[PDB]
Amino acid sequence: MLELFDVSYEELQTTFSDRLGWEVICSQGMESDEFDGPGTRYILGICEGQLVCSVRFTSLDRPNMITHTFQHCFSDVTLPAYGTESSRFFVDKARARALLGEHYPISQVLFLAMVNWAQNNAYGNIYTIVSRAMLKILTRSGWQIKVIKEAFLTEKERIYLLTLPAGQDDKQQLGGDVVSRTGCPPVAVTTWPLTLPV
């Protein structure tokens, strides 16, 4: 099965096949940057002791990619006092194929996990900066994302500040898509953490 749950930076620091699996997971993760610290949280997608996907959440009131890294691109945008930014979206397509089989909608499942996690954490939406390629993916996912601002990273590189909705309609929308694509039990997409049969 595929387990999607969240862990804190502190848990990743403060802490047989268990220790080993955890070490393999850590060795497969995204290398740190200025924002990995107390307060930061991560959703991990794990199967058979291996990391198939992950995404990082940072509070909007703490240093993040919108306010720091890409400050010059979005400084005209006013952000809410309370909120979360998702970054470092990660899906190992090669490894997911091996463990979850080809055609498993691992990306849609992580989107669902983000919504389910957000509801469990009192966030009605998630802010994020994505590449043009990722914007195309999100747009095709059906998730009713909203572009707040399109920016030019470079002359030919466009990036976008978006809000990702995490309301009940979104949870049912993403959940319904996952159910019909994997045939998993309907109740499996309604919880947090998530446990999906593969």
mmCIF file of C-alpha atoms in Angstrom:
data_model
loop_
_atom_site.group_PDB
_atom_site.id
_atom_site.type_symbol
_atom_site.label_atom_id
_atom_site.label_comp_id
_atom_site.label_asym_id
_atom_site.label_seq_id
_atom_site.Cartn_x
_atom_site.Cartn_y
_atom_site.Cartn_z
ATOM 1 C CA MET A 1 0.000 0.000 0.000
ATOM 2 C CA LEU A 2 0.813 3.701 -0.372
ATOM 3 C CA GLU A 3 1.029 5.769 2.833
ATOM 4 C CA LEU A 4 0.733 9.586 2.677
ATOM 5 C CA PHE A 5 1.270 11.355 5.986
ATOM 6 C CA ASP A 6 2.991 14.435 7.342
ATOM 7 C CA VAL A 7 6.091 14.869 9.482
ATOM 8 C CA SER A 8 7.634 17.953 11.020
ATOM 9 C CA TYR A 9 11.154 19.268 10.551
ATOM 10 C CA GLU A 10 11.614 18.626 14.270
ATOM 11 C CA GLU A 11 10.560 14.988 13.907
ATOM 12 C CA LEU A 12 12.975 14.581 11.001
ATOM 13 C CA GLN A 13 15.683 15.948 13.296
ATOM 14 C CA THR A 14 14.629 14.958 16.826
ATOM 15 C CA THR A 15 14.498 11.444 15.385
ATOM 16 C CA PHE A 16 15.454 -3.237 12.100
ATOM 17 C CA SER A 17 13.822 -2.504 8.735
ATOM 18 C CA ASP A 18 12.428 0.566 10.507
ATOM 19 C CA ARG A 19 15.612 2.574 11.001
ATOM 20 C CA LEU A 20 16.827 1.336 7.613
ATOM 21 C CA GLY A 21 13.629 2.310 5.816
ATOM 22 C CA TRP A 22 13.842 5.741 7.411
ATOM 23 C CA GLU A 23 17.433 6.160 6.310
ATOM 24 C CA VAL A 24 16.554 5.191 2.739
ATOM 25 C CA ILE A 25 13.679 7.663 2.832
ATOM 26 C CA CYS A 26 15.947 10.463 4.035
ATOM 27 C CA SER A 27 18.590 9.600 1.427
ATOM 28 C CA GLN A 28 15.897 9.954 -1.251
ATOM 29 C CA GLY A 29 14.664 13.383 -0.189
ATOM 30 C CA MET A 30 15.141 16.932 -1.509
ATOM 31 C CA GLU A 31 18.354 18.588 -0.216
ATOM 32 C CA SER A 32 17.733 21.403 2.285
ATOM 33 C CA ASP A 33 17.575 25.104 1.535
ATOM 34 C CA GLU A 34 17.089 28.299 3.601
ATOM 35 C CA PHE A 35 13.532 27.364 4.561
ATOM 36 C CA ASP A 36 13.964 23.887 6.071
ATOM 37 C CA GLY A 37 13.601 24.448 9.819
ATOM 38 C CA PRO A 38 11.314 24.492 12.901
ATOM 39 C CA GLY A 39 7.752 25.022 11.726
ATOM 40 C CA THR A 40 8.299 23.460 8.318
ATOM 41 C CA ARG A 41 6.204 20.372 7.635
ATOM 42 C CA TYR A 42 6.379 17.711 4.925
ATOM 43 C CA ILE A 43 3.995 15.276 3.358
ATOM 44 C CA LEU A 44 5.746 12.008 2.502
ATOM 45 C CA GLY A 45 4.315 9.375 0.135
ATOM 46 C CA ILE A 46 5.867 6.047 1.088
ATOM 47 C CA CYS A 47 5.602 2.497 -0.140
ATOM 48 C CA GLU A 48 7.652 -0.483 0.999
ATOM 49 C CA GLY A 49 10.007 1.757 2.964
ATOM 50 C CA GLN A 50 10.692 4.010 -0.010
ATOM 51 C CA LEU A 51 9.865 7.633 -0.825
ATOM 52 C CA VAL A 52 7.723 8.057 -3.947
ATOM 53 C CA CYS A 53 6.662 11.662 -3.435
ATOM 54 C CA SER A 54 6.733 14.622 -1.096
ATOM 55 C CA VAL A 55 5.899 18.241 -0.707
ATOM 56 C CA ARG A 56 6.895 20.882 1.819
ATOM 57 C CA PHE A 57 4.723 23.366 3.639
ATOM 58 C CA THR A 58 5.973 26.617 5.125
ATOM 59 C CA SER A 59 3.846 29.134 7.070
ATOM 60 C CA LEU A 60 3.338 32.373 5.183
ATOM 61 C CA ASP A 61 4.499 34.285 8.253
ATOM 62 C CA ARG A 62 7.894 32.629 8.074
ATOM 63 C CA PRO A 63 10.547 33.185 5.395
ATOM 64 C CA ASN A 64 9.473 31.400 2.209
ATOM 65 C CA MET A 65 9.956 31.365 -1.537
ATOM 66 C CA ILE A 66 7.236 33.912 -2.215
ATOM 67 C CA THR A 67 8.491 36.537 0.220
ATOM 68 C CA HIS A 68 12.203 35.823 -0.047
ATOM 69 C CA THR A 69 13.501 33.835 -3.036
ATOM 70 C CA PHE A 70 11.105 35.393 -5.565
ATOM 71 C CA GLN A 71 10.376 38.572 -3.643
ATOM 72 C CA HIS A 72 11.152 40.716 -6.690
ATOM 73 C CA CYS A 73 8.584 38.836 -8.792
ATOM 74 C CA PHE A 74 5.596 39.041 -6.449
ATOM 75 C CA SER A 75 6.181 41.958 -4.079
ATOM 76 C CA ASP A 76 3.043 43.655 -5.433
ATOM 77 C CA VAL A 77 0.908 40.759 -4.226
ATOM 78 C CA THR A 78 -0.479 41.064 -0.701
ATOM 79 C CA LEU A 79 -0.524 37.799 1.184
ATOM 80 C CA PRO A 80 -2.871 36.852 4.076
ATOM 81 C CA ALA A 81 -1.472 37.108 7.609
ATOM 82 C CA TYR A 82 -2.372 33.450 8.085
ATOM 83 C CA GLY A 83 -1.633 30.748 5.528
ATOM 84 C CA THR A 84 0.707 28.165 4.090
ATOM 85 C CA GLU A 85 3.005 27.915 1.056
ATOM 86 C CA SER A 86 3.720 24.567 -0.601
ATOM 87 C CA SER A 87 7.090 24.109 -2.275
ATOM 88 C CA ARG A 88 9.513 21.449 -3.464
ATOM 89 C CA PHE A 89 6.781 19.275 -4.952
ATOM 90 C CA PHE A 90 8.470 15.952 -5.632
ATOM 91 C CA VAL A 91 7.383 12.803 -7.422
ATOM 92 C CA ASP A 92 9.849 10.102 -8.364
ATOM 93 C CA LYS A 93 8.093 8.843 -11.487
ATOM 94 C CA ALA A 94 10.623 6.096 -12.101
ATOM 95 C CA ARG A 95 10.361 4.726 -8.576
ATOM 96 C CA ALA A 96 6.571 5.136 -8.414
ATOM 97 C CA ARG A 97 6.227 3.115 -11.607
ATOM 98 C CA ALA A 98 8.315 0.322 -10.094
ATOM 99 C CA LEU A 99 6.401 0.174 -6.800
ATOM 100 C CA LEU A 100 2.887 1.369 -7.760
ATOM 101 C CA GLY A 101 2.908 0.186 -11.341
ATOM 102 C CA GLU A 102 2.695 2.326 -14.442
ATOM 103 C CA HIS A 103 -0.356 4.562 -14.831
ATOM 104 C CA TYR A 104 -0.806 4.921 -11.070
ATOM 105 C CA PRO A 105 -1.960 8.554 -10.627
ATOM 106 C CA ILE A 106 0.631 9.304 -7.943
ATOM 107 C CA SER A 107 0.558 13.037 -8.723
ATOM 108 C CA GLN A 108 -3.222 13.303 -8.306
ATOM 109 C CA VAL A 109 -2.889 11.390 -5.056
ATOM 110 C CA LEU A 110 -0.356 13.905 -3.732
ATOM 111 C CA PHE A 111 -2.698 16.745 -4.718
ATOM 112 C CA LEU A 112 -5.432 14.970 -2.747
ATOM 113 C CA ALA A 113 -3.070 14.542 0.194
ATOM 114 C CA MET A 114 -2.312 18.300 0.155
ATOM 115 C CA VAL A 115 -6.045 19.078 0.352
ATOM 116 C CA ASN A 116 -6.672 16.519 3.103
ATOM 117 C CA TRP A 117 -3.639 17.777 5.045
ATOM 118 C CA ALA A 118 -4.749 21.409 4.624
ATOM 119 C CA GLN A 119 -8.206 20.642 6.000
ATOM 120 C CA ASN A 120 -6.600 18.912 8.950
ATOM 121 C CA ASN A 121 -4.511 22.020 9.520
ATOM 122 C CA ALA A 122 -7.039 24.833 9.208
ATOM 123 C CA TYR A 123 -5.938 26.103 5.770
ATOM 124 C CA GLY A 124 -8.688 26.831 3.284
ATOM 125 C CA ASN A 125 -6.207 27.174 0.434
ATOM 126 C CA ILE A 126 -2.504 26.725 -0.252
ATOM 127 C CA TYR A 127 -0.201 29.311 -1.896
ATOM 128 C CA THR A 128 2.510 28.092 -4.273
ATOM 129 C CA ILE A 129 4.916 29.126 -7.006
ATOM 130 C CA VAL A 130 5.084 26.825 -9.973
ATOM 131 C CA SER A 131 6.772 26.505 -13.329
ATOM 132 C CA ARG A 132 4.819 26.788 -16.560
ATOM 133 C CA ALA A 133 5.037 23.015 -16.963
ATOM 134 C CA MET A 134 3.594 22.410 -13.523
ATOM 135 C CA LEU A 135 0.846 24.982 -14.157
ATOM 136 C CA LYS A 136 -0.138 22.903 -17.197
ATOM 137 C CA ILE A 137 -0.239 19.769 -15.026
ATOM 138 C CA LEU A 138 -2.375 21.426 -12.360
ATOM 139 C CA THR A 139 -4.696 22.884 -14.936
ATOM 140 C CA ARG A 140 -5.205 19.446 -16.516
ATOM 141 C CA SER A 141 -5.767 17.891 -13.084
ATOM 142 C CA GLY A 142 -9.180 19.498 -12.744
ATOM 143 C CA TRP A 143 -8.095 21.050 -9.446
ATOM 144 C CA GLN A 144 -9.620 24.557 -9.604
ATOM 145 C CA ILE A 145 -6.387 26.401 -9.037
ATOM 146 C CA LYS A 146 -6.261 30.173 -9.344
ATOM 147 C CA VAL A 147 -3.410 32.142 -10.849
ATOM 148 C CA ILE A 148 -2.674 35.138 -8.680
ATOM 149 C CA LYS A 149 0.214 36.381 -10.776
ATOM 150 C CA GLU A 150 2.300 35.340 -13.748
ATOM 151 C CA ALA A 151 5.925 36.399 -13.519
ATOM 152 C CA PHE A 152 8.950 36.189 -15.741
ATOM 153 C CA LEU A 153 11.739 34.373 -13.962
ATOM 154 C CA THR A 154 13.855 35.045 -17.050
ATOM 155 C CA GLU A 155 13.224 36.314 -20.572
ATOM 156 C CA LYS A 156 11.693 32.982 -21.621
ATOM 157 C CA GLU A 157 10.990 31.418 -18.185
ATOM 158 C CA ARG A 158 7.516 32.031 -16.753
ATOM 159 C CA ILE A 159 6.501 31.167 -13.209
ATOM 160 C CA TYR A 160 3.197 31.589 -11.460
ATOM 161 C CA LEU A 161 1.922 32.399 -7.996
ATOM 162 C CA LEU A 162 -1.218 30.340 -7.372
ATOM 163 C CA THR A 163 -3.722 29.516 -4.713
ATOM 164 C CA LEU A 164 -4.779 25.864 -4.556
ATOM 165 C CA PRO A 165 -8.282 25.411 -3.069
ATOM 166 C CA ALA A 166 -8.689 22.972 -0.197
ATOM 167 C CA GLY A 167 -12.451 23.174 0.401
ATOM 168 C CA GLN A 168 -14.862 20.236 0.590
ATOM 169 C CA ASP A 169 -15.630 20.449 -3.142
ATOM 170 C CA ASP A 170 -11.933 20.157 -3.899
ATOM 171 C CA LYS A 171 -11.454 17.214 -1.551
ATOM 172 C CA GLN A 172 -14.398 15.434 -3.195
ATOM 173 C CA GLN A 173 -13.230 16.370 -6.650
ATOM 174 C CA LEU A 174 -9.680 15.076 -6.240
ATOM 175 C CA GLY A 175 -10.860 12.135 -4.162
ATOM 176 C CA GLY A 176 -13.422 11.138 -6.783
ATOM 177 C CA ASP A 177 -10.825 11.296 -9.528
ATOM 178 C CA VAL A 178 -8.471 9.026 -7.553
ATOM 179 C CA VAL A 179 -11.210 6.535 -6.765
ATOM 180 C CA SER A 180 -12.339 6.202 -10.376
ATOM 181 C CA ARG A 181 -8.716 5.918 -11.578
ATOM 182 C CA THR A 182 -7.559 3.342 -9.047
ATOM 183 C CA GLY A 183 -10.785 1.680 -7.974
ATOM 184 C CA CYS A 184 -9.677 2.053 -4.363
ATOM 185 C CA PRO A 185 -12.336 1.900 -1.631
ATOM 186 C CA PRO A 186 -14.203 5.273 -1.580
ATOM 187 C CA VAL A 187 -13.545 5.837 2.137
ATOM 188 C CA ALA A 188 -9.791 5.560 1.480
ATOM 189 C CA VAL A 189 -9.624 9.064 -0.040
ATOM 190 C CA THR A 190 -11.521 10.762 2.777
ATOM 191 C CA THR A 191 -8.943 10.478 5.559
ATOM 192 C CA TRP A 192 -5.750 12.043 6.864
ATOM 193 C CA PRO A 193 -3.228 10.450 6.928
ATOM 194 C CA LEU A 194 -4.005 8.600 3.738
ATOM 195 C CA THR A 195 -3.558 4.863 3.180
ATOM 196 C CA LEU A 196 -4.201 3.695 -0.371
ATOM 197 C CA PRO A 197 -4.139 0.128 -1.698
ATOM 198 C CA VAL A 198 -1.881 -0.357 -4.685
#
